[PDB]
Design an enzyme around this catalytic site. Structure first.
Site, PDB file in Angstrom:
ATOM      1  N   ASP A 160      35.314  19.016 -26.765  1.00 28.99           N
ATOM      2  CA  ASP A 160      34.151  19.318 -25.948  1.00 28.99           C
ATOM      3  C   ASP A 160      33.749  18.129 -25.067  1.00 28.99           C
ATOM      4  OD1 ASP A 160      33.569  21.955 -26.893  1.00 28.99           O
ATOM      5  OD2 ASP A 160      32.806  21.057 -28.758  1.00 28.99           O
ATOM      6  N   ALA A 177       0.806  -1.219   0.000  1.00 34.11           N
ATOM      7  CA  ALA A 177       0.000   0.000   0.000  1.00 34.11           C
ATOM      8  C   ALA A 177       0.842   1.275   0.000  1.00 34.11           C
ATOM      9  CB  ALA A 177      -0.959   0.003   1.191  1.00 34.11           C
ATOM     10  N   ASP A 235      30.527  20.258 -30.504  1.00 33.36           N
ATOM     11  CA  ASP A 235      30.595  19.364 -31.653  1.00 33.36           C
ATOM     12  C   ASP A 235      31.956  18.714 -31.773  1.00 33.36           C
ATOM     13  OD1 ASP A 235      32.002  21.669 -32.456  1.00 33.36           O
ATOM     14  OD2 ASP A 235      31.502  21.383 -34.570  1.00 33.36           O
ATOM     15  N   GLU A 285      -3.924   4.680   1.295  1.00 33.22           N
ATOM     16  CA  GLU A 285      -3.978   3.227   1.379  1.00 33.22           C
ATOM     17  C   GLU A 285      -3.357   2.760   2.681  1.00 33.22           C
ATOM     18  OE1 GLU A 285      -2.324   1.437  -2.092  1.00 33.22           O
ATOM     19  OE2 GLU A 285      -3.743   2.464  -3.441  1.00 33.22           O
ATOM     20  N   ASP A 334      30.357  25.557 -26.790  1.00 34.75           N
ATOM     21  CA  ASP A 334      31.448  25.674 -27.714  1.00 34.75           C
ATOM     22  C   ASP A 334      31.054  26.733 -28.800  1.00 34.75           C
ATOM     23  OD1 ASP A 334      33.749  24.734 -29.323  1.00 34.75           O
ATOM     24  OD2 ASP A 334      32.104  23.994 -30.587  1.00 34.75           O
ATOM     25  N   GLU A 367      41.372  28.963 -47.747  1.00 37.33           N
ATOM     26  CA  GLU A 367      41.438  28.969 -49.218  1.00 37.33           C
ATOM     27  C   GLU A 367      40.089  28.664 -49.852  1.00 37.33           C
ATOM     28  OE1 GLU A 367      45.777  28.397 -50.817  1.00 37.33           O
ATOM     29  OE2 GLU A 367      44.897  26.444 -50.309  1.00 37.33           O
ATOM     30  N   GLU A 375     -10.155   7.885  -5.903  1.00 35.01           N
ATOM     31  CA  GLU A 375      -8.949   8.067  -6.701  1.00 35.01           C
ATOM     32  C   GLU A 375      -9.258   8.614  -8.091  1.00 35.01           C
ATOM     33  OE1 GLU A 375      -6.000   8.343  -5.782  1.00 35.01           O
ATOM     34  OE2 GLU A 375      -6.671   7.940  -3.736  1.00 35.01           O
TER      35      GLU A 375
HETATM   36  F1  ALF Z   1      34.867  26.833 -30.377  1.00 33.40           F
HETATM   37 AL1  ALF Z   1      35.457  25.170 -30.087  1.00 33.40          AL
HETATM   38  F2  ALF Z   1      36.060  23.523 -29.857  1.00 33.40           F
HETATM   39  F3  ALF Z   1      36.130  25.614 -28.497  1.00 33.40           F
HETATM   40  F4  ALF Z   1      34.710  24.718 -31.620  1.00 33.40           F
HETATM   41 MG   LIG Z   2      33.463  23.257 -32.200  1.00 34.38          MG
END
Ligand code: ALF
Ligand SMILES: [Mg+2]
Ligand SMILES: C/C=C(/C)C(=O)O[C@H]1C(C)=C2[C@H]([C@@H]1OC(=O)CCCCCCC)[C@@](C)(OC(C)=O)C[C@H](OC(=O)CCC)[C@@]1(O)[C@H]2OC(=O)[C@@]1(C)O
Ligand SMILES: [K+]
Length: 994
Positions: free
Chosen positions: A707, A305, A703, A771, A351, A442, A908
């Protein structure tokens, strides 16, 4: 070998006692292999299928519920020849549930990718060494490399260990260190000491780090460290050592379970003391073992209960459906529990590159010379839109689109950007996007040339594949690149020697097209191009040009700038020696200055808006980047982390500047600063850790491999869909669309889900309170159990379970993203709500134990009325002369329990309605506000009837259906709970805190 970056090459060789043209002996290698171990990261591994099981059964309540299962089994097992087929349903139902939960739990953690294994992909199988027994290079297993090895690396290699560079064989050594810094831009290495003992990786320009890769060139080095003792090994160890905490909700559920076991315990003691009377004077009918059976059955009921056995299933279903909605909005959630935590996030660490920015280097400004008036120089500046390598965007003059081909200077600028270039663009058909081929800085020029379309080439009808290099290819039809004078560190420029195409009328004579760092290129210009003419470079003209470039390179722009130039009369080919880069500067003299481009890695379009929204929800955003501080701050301004003119002296820090703060002030800097730059992977997790030391729920977004430690440390790690597999496998969530907006939507969903979760948690746990009161009331009085475990299990699992889930779909509050985050220490039930639930708890117990008494007494059928005898029914056996006019068994009748179950159920169901809003009357917020709630109540009620009216259900549940009169009573007893809670809500709404 430590401090390799600050030793000289001579000191590194003298340290290991090796010659650079010999390398270690094979016996030395064996010795080093024994002393330093192999050059590899250990695998994480672990968690056997069997130990996933074991951990499912360590939860306190699961133990308590398991203990009741066996106690129940032992009881059910040794029973009379009355009914020994429906006896075991109780134990099995309890055992079934526990097993059910467990198998589900193990399926949740079974499928979990290893972030450390993904890291191991930066570990090349093979490396190249010079050792003493052979003159030529030896290709060996990278794991057999040791400190002291003379190692060779070349273009396309993954660096196999942490290496002090000794000798660069090519003109430059260009290294992609993004796994350590998040930046893919080529680092140009050299061999001189870096004296600073605290150099970050970005400063160690004479080192090669294991797991990075060579973008160009060839070099020799000596291995300083291998295995875990490398920069990538530190990332690995930080991940191994992290380590996901219980979510705030989990902690409240754990604390609940702890407090529940104390309560259960104290109550069991009580039932014992309450029976210390029947102890020394128990008639001896009697006594014997009858007491053990009785007492233990009360323990089992108390346990059942007290515990919301349906809750885990309810929570899982809620989280799983939440996960599916999130996936529709492009947030892929890998950790179910993280659906909640995201909602009370108070700080988002982020990041920069590829996360807040596109990671696609883009030329956004450029200029040429319009006129020269002896000393006055008029520049013609343009801007260019578009933020990716896609050839999409336009050239603007004063913010309006122009055709670049209108301007001869721009024709020449594009020609240089096209020809003086080792990169290109590629349309990746599988991903559906344009990608760079070669160096970002480039490819920026390639993309710019495609946007400029200076010959007005028709491109609208090319496929995307063919569109990628179309305008550059047109320029390649006019001028033939004969050869390249590659970039060297002494001059910081490069050039290409071209001849007009055969049959071209548009030009005559060979040309060198030059690009590079502005200062050195401009110093080498004797002329300046003005349209098609050229005039001498004078001091005042040179000064104006350099000043403007200097502005582009700093302040709010902080662009990377290249000066573009042409040698109008190059040396004759045969007068130039192409095998000695030291001559290239002289070949690139007497130049004519043409123009300048300025490029950056730009913000994603949605980011500024998202950050504002986070700010509206009380959520701080902090940039933490491996990139330089000047760039970090400028991006912060563009996305609104800082104001355009805000002074950021103590709001922005390099990792080193941060490290220099006293420990007390590092903690406070984390609350004040919104930009950290030039950091190492461990700076990010450190910052996250400081934030958490204020008990803030911290998210991390990124990414990159660098990180990963922070992504692991944060309560919620969030990885970009197109980012590294390492960051993704380190994360609780992945933004499949790379859209930062999705984080905001995810936070909102988490807030909405959590608001609903606590209602269904409130709903279910409060029923358990009622209960327990029932079981205890029907013991401290000596009454015949008004409810039994099997009935309690059905309610807590199904009857109340369905409405609990329905509440999970209460309409969300409309101001949800205008509130600040909830405190993660917020109790689910406290203060007025608490005593309020005590009052329903009391109501539920009396109402239930009451309905049964009513049946034993006032009910027509109706043994009946007994008074003193009901509270002494265990004596119908022996002391029968008192129990006359009734069968010694009518005290185990189903009717009383069915009245009690129907009251419990009806209450209930009403309480499910009361739980729609915490403080709003059903008059102000009506049932039909959540259609699925009504639907669920109808279902639970039709299930109740099922068990009342369908054999053998009533036999196994010990129920007998009721007539209209008995129901009429069920309602009078039950429905007032709505009235009770409306009054309690009424006061809370007005007098209490309103
Ligand atoms: F800005 Al970063 F790893 F620190 F992409
Ligand atoms: Mg990055
Ligand atoms: C559920 C069934 C009852 C019997 C119980 O054990 O829960 C208690 C207890 C464990 C707490 C209490 C219950 O305490 C009681 O009200 C005692 C009633 C029964 C005692 C004798 C009656 C015959 C909660 C249920 O009662 C309220 C609602 O009045 C509120 C809250 O619970 C929560 O906040 C839920 C957390 C997920 C907790 O005080 C919780 O413990 C604390 O750690 C919290 C913060 O958890
Ligand atoms: K994490």
């Amino acid at each position: 070998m430590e401090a390799a970056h600050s030793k000289s090459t001579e000191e590194c060789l003298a340290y290991f006692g090796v010659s650079e043209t010999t390398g270690l002996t094979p016996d030395q290698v064996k010795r080093h292999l024994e002393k330093y171990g192999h050059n590899e990261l250990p695998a994480e591994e672990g968690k056997s299928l069997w130990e996933l099981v074991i951990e499912q059964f360590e939860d306190l309540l699961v133990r308590i519920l398991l203990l009741a299962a066996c106690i129940s089994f032992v009881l059910a097992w040794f029973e009379e020849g009355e009914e020994t087929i429906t006896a075991f349903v109780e134990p099995f139902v309890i055992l079934l549930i526990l097993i059910a939960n467990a198998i589900v739990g193990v399926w949740q953690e079974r499928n979990a990718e290893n972030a450390i294994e993904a890291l191991k992909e930066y570990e090349p199988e093979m490396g190249k060494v010079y050792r003493a027994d052979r003159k030529s290079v030896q290709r060996i297993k990278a794991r057999d490399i040791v400190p002291g090895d003379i190692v060779e690396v070349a273009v396309g290699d993954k660096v196999p260990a942490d290496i002090r560079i000794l000798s660069i064989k090519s003109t430059t050594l260009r290294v992609d260190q993004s796994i350590l810094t998040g930046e893919s831009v080529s680092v140009i290495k050299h061999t001189e000491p870096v004296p600073d003992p605290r150099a970050v990786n970005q400063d160690k320009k004479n080192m090669l780090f294991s797991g990075t890769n060579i973008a160009a060139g060839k070099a020799l080095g000596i291995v300083a460290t291998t295995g875990v003792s490398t920069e990538i090994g530190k990332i690995r160890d930080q991940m191994a050592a992290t380590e996901q905490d219980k979510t705030p909700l989990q902690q409240k559920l754990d604390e609940f379970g702890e407090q529940l076991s104390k309560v259960i315990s104290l109550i069991c003691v009580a039932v014992w003391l309450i029976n210390i009377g029947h102890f020394n004077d128990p008639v001896h009918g009697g006594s014997w073992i009858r007491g053990a059976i009785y007492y233990f059955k009360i323990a089992v009921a108390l346990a059942v209960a007290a515990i919301p056995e349906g809750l885990p299933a309810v929570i899982t279903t809620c989280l799983a459906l939440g996960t599916r909605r999130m996936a529709k909005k492009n947030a892929i959630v890998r950790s179910l529990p993280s659906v909640e935590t995201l909602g009370c996030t108070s700080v988002i660490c982020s990041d920069k590159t590829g996360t807040l920015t596109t990671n696609q280097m883009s030329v956004c400004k450029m200029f040429i010379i319009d006129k020269v008036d002896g000393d006055f120089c008029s520049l013609n500046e343009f801007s260019i839109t578009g933020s990716t390598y896609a050839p999409e965007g336009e050239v603007l003059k004063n913010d309006k689109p122009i055709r670049s081909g209108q301007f001869d200077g721009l024709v020449e600028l594009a020609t240089i950007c096209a020809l003086c270039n080792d990169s290109s663009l590629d349309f990746n058909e599988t991903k559906g996007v344009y990608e760079k081929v070669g160096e970002a800085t480039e490819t920026a020029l390639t993309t710019l040339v495609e946007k400029m379309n200076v010959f007005n080439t028709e491109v609208r009808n090319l496929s995307k594949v063919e569109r990628a290099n179309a305008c550059n290819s047109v320029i390649r039809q006019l001028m033939k690149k004969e050869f390249t004078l590659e970039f060297s560190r002494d001059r910081k420029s490069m050039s290409v020697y071209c001849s007009p195409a055969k049959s071209s009328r548009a030009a005559v004579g060979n040309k060198m097209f030059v690009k590079g760092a502005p200062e050195g290129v401009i110093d080498r210009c004797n002329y300046v191009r003005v349209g098609t003419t050229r005039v001498p470079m004078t001091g005042p003209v040179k000064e104006k040009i350099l000043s403007v470039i200097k502005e582009w390179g700093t302040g709010r722009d902080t662009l990377r700038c290249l000066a573009l130039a042409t040698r109008d009369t190059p040396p004759k080919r045969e007068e130039m020696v192409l095998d000695d880069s030291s001559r290239f500067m002289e070949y690139e003299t007497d130049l004519t200055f043409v123009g300048v481009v300025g490029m950056l890695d730009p913000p994603r379009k949605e980011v500024m808006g998202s950050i504002q929204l986070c700010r509206d929800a009380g959520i701080r955003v902090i940039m933490i980047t491996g990139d330089n501080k000047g760039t970090a701050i400028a991006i912060c301004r563009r996305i609104g982390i800082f104001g355009e003119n805000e002074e950021v002296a103590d709001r922005a820090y390099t990792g080193r500047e941060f490290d220099d703060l006293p420990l007390a002030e590092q903690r406070e800097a984390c609350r004040r600063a919104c930009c950290f730059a030039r950091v190492e992977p461990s700076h990010k997790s450190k910052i996250v850790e400081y934030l958490q030391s204020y008990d803030e729920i911290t998210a991390m977004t990124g990414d990159g491999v660098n990180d990963a430690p922070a992504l692991k440390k944060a309560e919620i790690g969030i990885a970009m869909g197109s980012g590294t597999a390492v960051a993704k496998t380190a994360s609780e969530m992945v933004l499949a669309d790379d859209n930062f907006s999705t984080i905001v939507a995810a936070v909102e969903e988490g807030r909405a889900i959590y608001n609903n979760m606590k209602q269904f948690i409130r709903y279910l746990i409060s029923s358990n309170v009622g209960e327990v009161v029932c079981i205890f009331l029907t013991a401290a009085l000596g009454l015949p159990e008004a409810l039994i475990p099997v009935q309690l299990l059905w309610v807590n699992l199904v009857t109340d379970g369905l409405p609990a889930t329905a509440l999970g779909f209460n309409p969300p509050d409309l101001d949800i993203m205008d509130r600040p985050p909830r405190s993660p220490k917020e109790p689910l039930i406290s203060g007025w709500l608490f005593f309020r639930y005590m009052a329903i708890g009391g109501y539920v117990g009396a109402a239930t134990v009451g309905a049964a008494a009513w049946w034993f007494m006032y009910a027509e059928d109706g043994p009946g009325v007994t008074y003193h005898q009901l509270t002494h029914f265990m004596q119908c056996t022996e002391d029968h002369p008192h129990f006359e006019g009734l069968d010694c068994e009518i005290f185990e009748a189903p009717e009383p329990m069915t009245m009690a179950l129907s009251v419990l159920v009806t209450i209930e169901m009403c309480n499910a309605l009361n739980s729609l809003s915490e403080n709003q009357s059903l008059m102000r917020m009506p049932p039909w506000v959540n259609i699925w709630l009504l639907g669920s109540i109808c279902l639970s009620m039709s299930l109740h009837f099922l068990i009342l009216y369908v054999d053998p259900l009533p036999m196994i549940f010990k129920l007998k259906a009721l007539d209209l009169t008995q129901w009429l009573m069920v309602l009078k007893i039950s429905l007032p709970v709505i009235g009770l809670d409306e009054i309690l809500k009424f006061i809370a709404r007005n007098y209490l805190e309103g």
